[PDB]
Amino acid sequence: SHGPSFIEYNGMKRDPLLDPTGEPEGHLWRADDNDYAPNSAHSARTNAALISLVRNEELEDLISTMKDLERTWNSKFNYPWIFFNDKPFTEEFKKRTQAETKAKCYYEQVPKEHWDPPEWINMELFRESAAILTEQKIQYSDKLSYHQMCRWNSGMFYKHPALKNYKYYWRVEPKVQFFCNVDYDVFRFMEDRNLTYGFTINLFDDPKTVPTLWPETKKFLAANPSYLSSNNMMGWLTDDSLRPDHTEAANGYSTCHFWSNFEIGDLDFFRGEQYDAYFNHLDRAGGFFYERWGDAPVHSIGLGLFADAAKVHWFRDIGYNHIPYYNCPNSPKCSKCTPGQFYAGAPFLAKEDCRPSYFKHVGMH
Ligand code: NA
Ligand code: NA
């Protein structure tokens, strides 16, 4: 039912999002039953934050996003927002953002050591490979800052001092929509079930951004044979049954990833020995700069090799859009999205959905 449609792969045959979509099973923490007052010192909030890497120039898009997340969820639960940027935030940014929430907002700067390329990266080699990716990649002109963002999301955000006393994060990107009321504390949902990571969308990537990522991953695994988890996603990570040319071009990796612009995650997974050693291996290999290794594939591979797959959750009930893709469930809590419509735009976008592989090899839990 949830398997692949072919005409050539052309997306999902029957999207599970069409099924009546409700809340997860088990105990759920409700706002009407608990102290979630924004300034209460004895609230039901766990140690979690909404986080966003965002520039001053993206303020208007951020405000639209905050309005959706607040209306659908955070106006009831009042978790804090923590904003990150390599430059200082303006007073206008601070005033406008804090005006959209009753929760506390924090404004943080990424340190130089978490943003500047590391010493071992040769900037001439960077510029040469960037010129080639610029020539090859569709609707793409390279910038150093894209690579710095990917590296920051991959290995640095969870080392930031501001997050030291936090265990969970919900990553939010400046220009996104949320469509569905969510009436339970998602952070404590994760905590009570010892969940590691939550996603809404699962996509193929551009193999040109990651050609040596899987080869470098295999080198890391050969050097650290005890790191591979028992409940791993090797079948999903190495699948070639939907788009075999992607898997060939990325040298053994399907390119499939959790679409990391949305994440709800356990910071302590990424801080752990296994994932962080993986990140540092990749950091030394140089592919964050000499290629364009995305934080999405890097997170997805890390989770798929080192996490328990039973602790990774599809948040099917969180209606979500980041252009051009959607997670829109069939629920009366949602509005202004079409249930089960994966994409908006030209029909060639349909094949970018990797959930039929993820659901086969890992599951829909
Ligand atoms: Na309450
Ligand atoms: Na290009």
Residue-wise DSSP of 96-165: HHHTT-SS-EEEEE--GGGTSPPTT--HHHHHHHHHHHHHHSTT----HHHHHHHHIIIIIGGG-GGGTT
Report resolution (Å) to 1 decimal: 2.0
Closest CA to 339 of 102, 16, 4: 16
Tell me the two tokens of residue 235.
Answer: 């079948």
Annotated binding residues for Mn(2+), written as ranges, equal 173, 322
Residue extents of the structural domains in the chain: 4-362
DSSP 90: P
Contact in structure between 164 and 45 (CB atoms under 8 Å): no
Across-strand partners of 343?
Answer: 325
What does the buried/exposed string (b/e) look like for 120-135 if buried means 16 or more CB atoms within 10 Å of the residue's CB? ebeeeebeebbeebee
Strand (E) or helix (H) holding 77 = helix 75-77
Strand (E) or helix (H) holding 314 = strand 312-314
Assign residue 363 a region (left: φ > 0; alpha: ψ between -120 and 50; beta: otherwise): left
Chain position carrying tokens 């990571």? 197
DSSP 19: S
Sign of the alpha-carbon torsion through 83, 88, 91, 92:
negative
Strand (E) or helix (H) holding 187 = helix 186-192
User: For residue 149, what are the CA distances in angstroms to 236, 288, 293?
Assistant: 26, 10, 10
Contact in structure between 352 and 204 (CB atoms under 8 Å): yes
Give residue 204 CA to ligand 2 midpoint distance, Å.
18
Give residue 130 CA to ligand 2 midpoint distance, Å.
10
Q: Cα angle at 69 between 65 and 72, to 5 degrees? A: 135
Give residue 173 CA to ligand 2 midpoint distance, Å.
23
Chain position carrying tokens 């398997």? 3
Annotated binding residues, written as ranges, equal 53-55, 58, 85-86, 140, 146, 173, 322
Question: For residues 364 and 119, what is the distance between their CA atoms, to the nearest angstrom?
Answer: 42
Give the class (CATH, top level) of 4-362.
alpha beta
Annotated binding residues for GDP, written as ranges, equal 53-55, 58, 85-86, 140, 146
Going across the sheet that includes 197-199, the strands are 105-109, 81-85, 48-53, 168-171, 263-266, 197-199, 312-314
Maximal CA-CA distance, the chain: 59
Tell me the two tokens of residue 200.
Answer: 């809404």
> Nearest ligand, CA of residue 292?
2
Chain position carrying tokens 């924004």? 38
> Nearest ligand, CA of residue 76?
1
Question: For residues 13 and 244, what is the distance between their CA atoms, to the nearest angstrom?
Answer: 19
Give residue 298 CA to ligand 2 midpoint distance, Å.
22
Give residue 142 CA to ligand 2 midpoint distance, Å.
8
Tell me the two tokens of residue 206.
Answer: 């551009």
Contact in structure between 298 and 292 (CB atoms under 8 Å): no
Question: For residues 179 and 71, what is the distance between their CA atoms, to the nearest angstrom?
Answer: 9
Q: Is 253 exposed, middle or buried (0-12, 13-18, 19+ CB in 10 A)?
A: buried
- What residues act catalytically? 263
Give residue 131 CA to ligand 2 midpoint distance, Å.
9
Sign of the alpha-carbon torsion through 145, 146, 149, 155:
negative
Contact in structure between 164 and 267 (CB atoms under 8 Å): no
Tell me the two tokens of residue 318.
Answer: 């969180």
Closest CA to 54 of 84, 76, 31: 84
Chain position carrying tokens 């449609």? 5
Strand (E) or helix (H) holding 283 = helix 273-285
Q: Is the preceding peptide bond at 324 cis, omega within 30 degrees of 0?
A: yes
Give residue 259 CA to ligand 2 midpoint distance, Å.
22
Contact in structure between 220 and 344 (CB atoms under 8 Å): no
Question: For residues 228 and 40, what is the distance between their CA atoms, to the nearest angstrom?
Answer: 42
> Nearest ligand, CA of residue 32?
1
Contact in structure between 335 and 321 (CB atoms under 8 Å): no
Backbone angles phi, psi at 290, to 5 degrees: -75, -20
DSSP 70: I
User: For residue 327, what are the CA distances in angstroms to 124, 150, 200, 298?
Assistant: 41, 23, 6, 22
Give the number of other CB atoms < 10 A from CB of residue 184.
18
Question: For residues 249 and 202, what is the distance between their CA atoms, to the nearest angstrom?
Answer: 19
Rg (CA), the chain: 20
Chain position carrying tokens 């959706």? 68
User: Is residue 207 classed as helix, strand or coil in its secondary structure?
Assistant: helix
Contact in structure between 184 and 30 (CB atoms under 8 Å): yes
Q: Is 347 exposed, middle or buried (0-12, 13-18, 19+ CB in 10 A)?
A: exposed
> Nearest ligand, CA of residue 183?
1
Closest CA to 291 of 40, 156, 121, 139: 121
What does the buried/exposed string (b/e) look like for 38-60 if buried means 16 or more CB atoms within 10 Å of the residue's CB? beeeeebbbebbbbbbbeeebbe
Question: For residues 350 and 325, what is the distance between their CA atoms, to the nearest angstrom?
Answer: 9
Please state the length of the chain: 365
